[PDB]
Paper text:
The reaction center (RC) and light-harvesting complex 1 (LH1) form a RC–LH1 core supercomplex that is vital for the primary reactions of photosynthesis in purple phototrophic bacteria. The RC–LH1 supercomplex comprises an RC surrounded by the LH1 ring that is made of multiple αβ-heterodimers. LH1 collects photons directly from sunlight or from the peripheral antenna, light-harvesting complex 2 (LH2), and transfers excitation energy to the RC. In contrast, some Rhodobacter species, such as Rba. sphaeroides, possess dimeric RC–LH1 core structures, representing the largest photosynthetic complex in anoxygenic phototrophs.
To verify the roles of PufX in the RC–LH1 dimer, we genetically deleted the pufX gene (RSP_0255), which resulted in the exclusive formation of RC–LH1 monomers and loss of capability to perform photoheterotrophic growth, consistent with previous results. The cryo-EM structure of the ΔpufX RC–LH1 monomer at 4.20-Å resolution shows that the central RC is surrounded by a completely closed LH1 ring of 17 subunits, adopting a slightly elliptical shape (120 Å × 115 Å). The closed LH1 ring and the tightly packed pigments within LH1s impede quinone/quinol exchange, thereby causing the incapability of this mutant strain to grow photosynthetically. We could not obtain a higher-resolution cryo-EM structure of the ΔpufX RC–LH117 monomer, and the RC and PufY exhibit weaker densities than the peripheral LH1. Mass spectrometry confirmed that ~27% of PufY was retained in the ΔpufX RC–LH1 monomer compared to the WT monomer. Removal of PufX resulted in an RC–LH117 complex with a completely closed LH1 ring, and thereby the loss of phototrophic viability.
Numbering used by the authors:
A (entry chain Y), G (entry chain C), H (entry chain 6), K (entry chain 4): 1 to 54
B (entry chain L): 1 to 281
C (entry chain M): 2 to 306
D (entry chain Z): 8 to 49
E (entry chain H): 1 to 247
F (entry chain 1): 2 to 54
I (entry chain 5), J (entry chain 3), L (entry chain t): 5 to 49
M (entry chain 2): 10 to 49
Write the structure that this text describes.
């Protein structure tokens, strides 16, 4: 797969990088919020209910 | 007072009453013959609103209110504790807006530009004239007018709006509401390009008139140019007041029903109105 | 009676190809044919379409938001076009039921497809931002193209994603109807008593009017100087001609205070962004701050008590 | 080529980018492993 | 803040308004200020800096960098007019109009003014004149418009003043801007398309009369119109709107 | 077969950018469709199996 | 293909390929969505019904 | 019938083909949709009846 | 003879029409097969 | 006798059409396999 | 009736042909839809009762 | 004269009209067959 | 676009390699899910 | 490589400074998280 540098012969790196940055940030936000949304997977809720700290 | 280049633009002529009369300038503003009339009425019209407060006794700033007469009194004797105050304060402001608009034409003529600005305002006022002496009287009395109280801020919807239900379903109002968006969505681009060409990237040249087309053409795919917007902006904005005030007229003695039910007239269409399925049928 | 509406003499020819300083001509090719009606009204050039990366990005997500809502609506329509035609603008795409509330476990029928459909319109509107932005960057314009556009998006976002999360429910977002949205806007006022005493809405009430009212005059001032060279506005800041000189004083003589060509366009976007900026924080207060404007307006003496 | 980069320049840039990607992915793998141990989602 | 004000009625809710009261007024000061770039500081009839200037001061003069390699303009710099304002102050006393002393139309007062522009017949960003004569217009032609050739030019006073030969067309806007009406005297007069109102078959000039046709300002280049004349023609042409208000 | 020929007539850059947008949107759509259904909402079944709710 | 091959002369290949690709993807998506809308052919549901997944 | 071929001498082919394609596809779509609404002819519903899948 | 507006020749129009008719006959044949299959499966008369 | 908007040759059009038909046949073959699989799994007739 | 050929001398054949095609199709769809709407001559409807396919 | 705005000749108009009438007769014949078939199947009189 | 036969050859080879890699990952993922929970 | 015109040495120095700042900030964050977790763990 070493031949994959041709895409860098194709794409200006700055714009690819900024798109990637926005992409990664928004995705991490979305996954985190879907997580925290679920009552099952909500580390705050889990800690509150387990340690009896309501 | 005068600008660094104004002086030559003041010539004492063209005035609507008589060419050379009452055309002195009071500092920056101009006061003349028609210059008096709006100043005449607006000066008192405010102060009788102050007298509106004393009839209640309230002085809390917004809590001052001016109360129109109900349907009953009309053109008759009315206690100023109820009316003949809103009825008189009608005289001041109504004369004023006509006075101010027809005032404007003299200085328009003086500087030799079109009557559009007085034409635009005179048509803008026509929305207000719809609200008193037109909509009340078309039924027969000024009771069907909102109070001229500041704290009301047009909170007459209680009986006004919902007699027609969801009132944004006036067909003209459905048209009327949409217009101000069409102006406000387009308004940015002319406020952009002439200003975005006036202000480029700090460190880039000011733009050229050839640059002007290209930005807007590659973006959405169509440029009518500068004048098309100014005309549309006049086509839009006056239509918005035109299609708003006209439907104000047809609330009285034309529509006495709930505005949603009119759209059923399309659902009334005999060809496919009664095919079972979906939401209706 | 010539109030500056129609071109009287019609002249047409080869459209300008376009002028490039830092424009990527790879994305820009082709020209379009000429429009009939607007040639009376004015210009007719329809094109060219910059098939930009963001534009392509907006191209699909808008289209998927465009198309996919259609298909779930047919599931309401029962596959009957005459049914679909009749209750067109009656079909309405609901969000998840409030039991789910914030939680994203919705079924496809019960608002699951809203979050599916709404995510794609969420992509398209934000992606169109740069398509405006980047093209100015190529031509070295101001970024006002961006900042007036974000004005809408900040309030566009709060309708769906900002205001509903602060409570923690997706019901408090807008269902996707042609008429369910309109019933919803009336419904919002009823929910929090009356929306009357909501300030930042009432502030916004002023400024949408300021948009078209002011611009009717602004154009008319330009419409006044189409004789006086109003269409060459760009250098009418630089070379102040009779277009700038005469009408502005009429604004000195009527209003006392006057202005110039450069600063007059500041009011256009700056007043306009009050249309959207004010509501975004304003619509927030009804849900997460003031559950009933009818009592809250009583605090500061604009309500009857 | 839109960009005028050389084969050597693209080689170096790609090597750097892949190094960053592998670092980030390794951190992600560690995180997912930690969560799964703490509370598996399968 | 779950319905929880800080005290009494003042909470984050009113905080937004109280923010909005201060926030608006700052912009309005800025909006008033940024409109103050032509004709400041204020003057009087005599030419003295006026007594009142106002709380809002001049913003910083930013000299713009200009395209085309023509030069630079500093706005707002010292404001200049450089145009004929030979006049008579009707009164030394404060607050009076200014009577035209000699022929005003040469000078340009009231509706007749004409501004000192640049002396460059303006080329486009591509390097060619924005306004191009039809004969010199390579490629473009009269496509679907009422060719004014064949329409007797009529004034306000109902005299046949002339007849059109060509149109000096706006190449960028692709809408006509100027109309060649060479008069019986011999001089070739241009009239902007925008100014006069043509119906299906005639060319009527409602602002000025056929006597003022005789003095319509001449052009030095039969191939390019200069900027200074543009207003100077129109300032001549549009001024008579009130002088020829009778007739 | 042999599909090299498309590239010399049809632009590369647009192909890759459009394909990237397409694939991301498609993956998100399919994932959300899965997540909306009760079965294959793997979070809920993960909760139910380990009976934590 | 005896005579069909001249079609590419009258139609510019680039544009016809773009249009065909758009049309094909839209068609596949539409048909799949229609298929799912039918309760009998909701391939998620059949899986749920068979294995007694609640 | 013999001499129809001058219609191409009359019309530009490519526009004729664009119109023909749009017409044919839209026509097929509307016919199919009406059939699909038609309970007598909704093959997806008919597939259900013969096989006792509900 | 021809009118002269697209500028096609008699031979060009002949060839194009032959190709188009061949395509039309192919498509129509497929349609006939389809209709026959449906009618056998479930007639609509 | 090219007759296009486009300036392609007979040889160029020949090659392009051959490529396109190859792609069409490949895609159609995959579609046939898919439909056969579904029909075996659950016929819709 | 014999010198109807002058009609084409008066009108451009291409525009007339466009008009005829568009008009013919709109017309035909109109009549078909009306018949399909009327219960006597919705030819789909009869086929159900004659064959008792419900 | 030949009063030609379109500029067609008598021969050109003759040929075009013959072609158009042939097409009209073909289409009308198909329509007649269709109406006859429907009337036999279910008369509307 | 002006690409050569050799350039298009190389680009297509690279693209097909990427496609095969991505498809292989997809096949592995689908197999894993089907083993974990089949949808047929 | 002509997007900003920085040298290898300039970029080296700038990156070293930025990484030093990042490590400082991250260290403070680690201390804070440790303090909170000791005070009240969220796991
Ligand atoms: C219960 C915990 C959640 C979970 C919680 C998160 C969170 C939270 C995040 C990720 C992130 C990532 N997740 Mg995980 N993720 C889960 C299930 C999965 C599964 C799977 C089939 O099991 C996969 C393949 C992924 C894949 C991934 C990547 C897309 C990404 C890591 C960086 C990268 O792109 O490389 N997630 C489970 C269901 N994962 C991170 C990310 O967005 O990186 C960009 C991230 O923020
Ligand atoms: C259910 C109550 C209705 C309502 C009830 C009224 C009533 C009642 C009147 C108007 C009037 C006006 N309203 Mg309304 N109005 C509503 C919502 C809106 C919305 C919106 C949804 O964005 C807009 C832009 C408008 C806009 C306007 C104008 C169409 C019209 C004033 C005339 C003019 O010149 O302008 N309304 C709500 C939905 N509106 C008011 C006005 O000022 O008329 C002069 C007026 O009297
Ligand atoms: C004919 C025009 C309409 C009307 C339409 C509106 C609307 C709509 C709004 C105002 C708002 C305001 N109204 Mg008003 N208003 C009317 C009657 C009045 C009366 C009165 C006693 O008659 C007064 C003193 C005021 C005064 C005020 C201003 C202080 C304020 C700003 C106007 C603007 O910028 O536009 N209105 C009539 C009924 N006006 C605006 C504001 O700032 O609200 C906060 C606003 O939103
Ligand atoms: C129908 C019940 C409410 C109402 C419900 C809403 C709702 C809900 C919304 C608007 C929204 C808008 N409405 Mg309101 N609106 C009312 C009456 C009015 C009146 C009027 C004086 O007649 C006007 C001019 C308007 C006009 C407008 C704009 C000021 C505003 C859109 C700006 C934006 O970018 O978004 N509405 C009535 C009283 N309106 C937006 C807004 O600012 O909400 C706070 C919005 O989301
Ligand atoms: C109980 C489960 C964990 C969870 C499990 C994961 C998983 C799983 C992942 C992350 C990932 C990350 N999480 Mg964690 N994360 C949760 C809540 C948090 C919170 C928070 C207070 O909301 C924060 C600020 C973070 C912070 C972070 C980032 C360092 C990182 C995402 C950045 C990126 O680019 O992707 N997590 C809870 C507390 N976190 C991702 C990562 O490591 O990115 C490299 C990742 O894959
Ligand atoms: C129960 C399964 C569905 C079915 C499920 C699908 C799905 C799903 C798709 C197709 C696709 C196609 N279907 Mg099938 N299709 C069915 C019935 C049919 C019948 C028929 C009369 O039996 C035919 C001729 C077709 C025809 C076709 C083609 C239009 C297309 C394959 C590529 C192409 O164009 O060549 N479908 C049955 C009723 N078919 C595929 C496609 O869109 O290709 C572009 C596609 O995505
Ligand atoms: C019960 C009534 C008959 C019927 C009665 C007729 C009659 C009568 C005629 C046509 C003719 C036409 N009909 Mg049939 N037609 C029926 C069913 C159909 C259906 C369908 C999906 O069921 C369609 C799309 C068509 C379509 C059409 C065209 C094939 C043709 C007109 C084409 C044109 O240019 O005009 N018919 C039903 C079954 N149809 C016309 C024709 O022959 O055009 C040449 C014509 O005169
Ligand atoms: C649709 C027509 C609208 C209109 C337009 C309008 N009136 C205006 C303006 C504009 C654009 C001014 O520039 C002018 C002014 O002097 O503003 C400071 C004015 C003005 N609007 C005023 C008030 C006013 N006009 C009213 C009417 C209307 N004016 C409508 C809002 C109202 C309302 C809301 O009903 C009020 C309260 C005056 C103080 C002033 C006119 C001059 C004067 O002193 O009297
Ligand atoms: C100033 C406040 C108004 C606002 C702002 C606004 N929206 C904007 C912009 C601006 C300044 C653009 O120039 C930008 C654009 O590119 O328009 C063509 C856009 C845009 N606003 C859009 C939508 C939109 N905004 C609307 C409303 C408004 N937009 C507010 C009233 C409406 C309605 C319901 O009236 C619509 C339909 C698109 C036309 C466009 C973004 C392109 C897109 O994805 O669609
Ligand atoms: C030919 O046939 C086809 C199908 C192609 C059609 O032509 C049909 C065309 C249509 C347009 C179908 C009809 C559907 C439209 C009419 C939709 C109309 C939509 C509205 C009226 C509403 C618009 C927006 C309303 C609001 C307020 C939206 C909220 C703003 C956003 C912030 C919402 C973002 C929400 C979320 C959840 C983002 C996060 C995504 C999660 C998954 C994390
Ligand atoms: Fe300006």
């Amino acid at each position: 797969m070493s031949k994959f540098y041709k895409i860098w012969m194709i794409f200006d790196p700055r714009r690819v990088f900024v798109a990637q940055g926005v992409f990664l940030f928004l995705l991490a936000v979305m996954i985190h919020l879907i997580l925290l949304s679920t009552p099952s997977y909500n580390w705050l809720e889990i800690s509150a209910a387990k340690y009896n700290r309501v | 007072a005068l600008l660094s280049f104004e002086r030559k633009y003041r010539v004492p002529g063209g005035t609507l009453v008589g060419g050379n009369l009452f055309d002195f300038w009071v500092g920056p503003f101009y006061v003349g013959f028609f210059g008096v009339a709006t100043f005449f009425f607006a000066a008192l019209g405010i102060i009788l609103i102050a007298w509106s407060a004393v009839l209640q006794g309230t002085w809390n700033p917004q809590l001052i209110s001016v109360y129109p007469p109900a349907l009953e009194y009309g053109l008759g004797g009315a206690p100023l504790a109820k009316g003949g105050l809103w009825q008189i304060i009608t005289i001041c402001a109504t004369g004023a807006f006509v006075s101010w608009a027809l005032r404007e034409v003299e200085i328009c003529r003086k500087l030799g530009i079109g009557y559009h600005i007085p034409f635009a305002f005179a048509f803008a006022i026509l929305a207000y004239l719809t609200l008193v002496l037109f909509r009340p009287v078309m039924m027969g009395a000024w009771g069907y007018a909102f109070p001229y109280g500041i704290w009301t801020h047009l909170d007459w919807v209680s009986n006004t709006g919902y007699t027609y239900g969801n009132f944004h379903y006036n067909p003209a109002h459905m048209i009327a509401i949409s217009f101000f968006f069409t102006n406000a969505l387009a308004l940015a681009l002319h406020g952009a390009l002439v200003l975005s060409a006036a202000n480029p990237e700090k460190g880039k040249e000011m733009r050229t008139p050839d640059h002007e087309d290209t930005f807007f053409r590659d973006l959405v795919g169509y440029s009518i140019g500068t004048l098309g917007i100014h005309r549309l902006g006049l086509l839009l904005s006056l239509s918005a007041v035109f299609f708003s005030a006209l439907c104000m007229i047809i609330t009285g003695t034309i529509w006495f029903d709930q505005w949603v039910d009119w759209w059923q007239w399309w659902v009334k269409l005999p060809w496919w109105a009664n095919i079972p399925g979906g939401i209706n049928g | 009676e010539y109030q500056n509406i129609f071109s009287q003499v019609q002249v047409r020819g080869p459209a300008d190809l376009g002028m490039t300083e830092d424009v990527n001509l790879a994305n820009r090719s082709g020209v379009g044919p000429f429009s009939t009606l607007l040639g009376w009204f004015g210009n007719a050039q329809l094109g060219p379409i910059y098939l930009g990366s963001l534009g392509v990005l907006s191209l699909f997500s808008g289209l998927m938001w465009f198309f996919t809502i259609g298909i779930w609506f047919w599931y309401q329509a029962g596959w009957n076009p005459a049914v679909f035609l009749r209750d067109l603008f009656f079909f309405s795409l609901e969000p998840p039921a409030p039991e789910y509330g914030l939680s994203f476990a919705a079924p496809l029928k019960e608002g699951g497809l809203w979050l599916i459909a709404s995510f794609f319109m969420f992509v398209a509107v934000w992606s169109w931002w740069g398509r405006t932005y980047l093209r100015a960057q190529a031509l070295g314009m101001g970024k006002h193209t961006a900042w007036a556009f974000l004005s809408a998006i900040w309030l566009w976002m709060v309708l769906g994603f900002i205001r509903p999360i602060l409570m923690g429910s997706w019901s408090e977002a807008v269902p996707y109807g042609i008429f369910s949205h309109l019933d919803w806007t009336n419904n919002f006022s009823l929910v929090h008593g009356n929306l009357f005493y909501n300030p930042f809405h009432g502030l916004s009430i002023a400024f949408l009017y300021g948009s078209a009212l002011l611009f009717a005059m602004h154009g008319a001032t330009i419409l006044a100087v189409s004789r006086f060279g109003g269409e060459r506005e760009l250098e009418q800041i630089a070379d102040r001609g009779t277009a700038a000189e005469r009408a502005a004083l009429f604004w000195r003589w009527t209003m006392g205070f006057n202005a110039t060509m450069e600063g007059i366009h500041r009011w256009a976007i700056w007043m306009a962004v009050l249309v959207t900026l004010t509501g975004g924080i304003g619509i927030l207060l009804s849900g997460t701050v003031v559950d009933n404007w009818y009592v809250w307006g009583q605090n500061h003496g604009m309500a009857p008590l | 080529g839109y960009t005028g980069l050389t084969d050597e320049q693209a080689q170096e840039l790609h090597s750097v980018y892949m190094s960053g990607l592998w670092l980030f992915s390794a951190v992600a793998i560690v995180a997912h492993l930690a969560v799964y141990i703490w509370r598996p989602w399968f | 803040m779950v319905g929880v004000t800080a005290f009494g009625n003042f909470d984050l809710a009113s905080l937004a308004i109280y923010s909005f009261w201060i926030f608006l007024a700052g912009l309005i000061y800025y909006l008033q200020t940024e409109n103050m770039r032509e004709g400041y500081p204020l003057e009087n009839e005599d030419g003295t800096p006026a007594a009142n200037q106002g709380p809002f001061p001049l913003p910083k003069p930013k000299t713009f960098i200009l395209p085309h390699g023509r030069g630079t303009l500093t706005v707002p710099g010292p404001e200049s007019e450089d145009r004929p304002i030979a006049l008579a102050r009707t009164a030394v006393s404060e607050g009076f109009p200014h009577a035209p002393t000699g022929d005003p139309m040469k000078d340009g007062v009231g509706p007749a003014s004409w501004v000192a522009r640049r002396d460059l017949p303006e080329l486009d960003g591509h390097g060619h004149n924005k306004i191009k004569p039809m004969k010199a217009a390579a490629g473009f032609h009269v496509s679907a418009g009422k060719n004014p050739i064949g329409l007797p030019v009529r004034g306000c006073d109902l005299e046949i003043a002339g007849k059109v030969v060509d149109i000096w067309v706006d190449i960028p806007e692709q809408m006509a801007r100027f109309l060649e009406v060479e008069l019986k005297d011999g001089s070739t007069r241009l009239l902007p398309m925008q100014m006069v109102k043509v119906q299906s078959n005639r060319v009527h000039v409602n602002a000025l009369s056929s006597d003022l046709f005789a003095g319509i300002p001449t052009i030095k280049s039969p191939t390019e119109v200069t900027l200074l004349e543009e207003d100077k023609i129109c300032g001549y042409v549009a001024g008579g709107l009130m002088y020829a208000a009778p007739k």
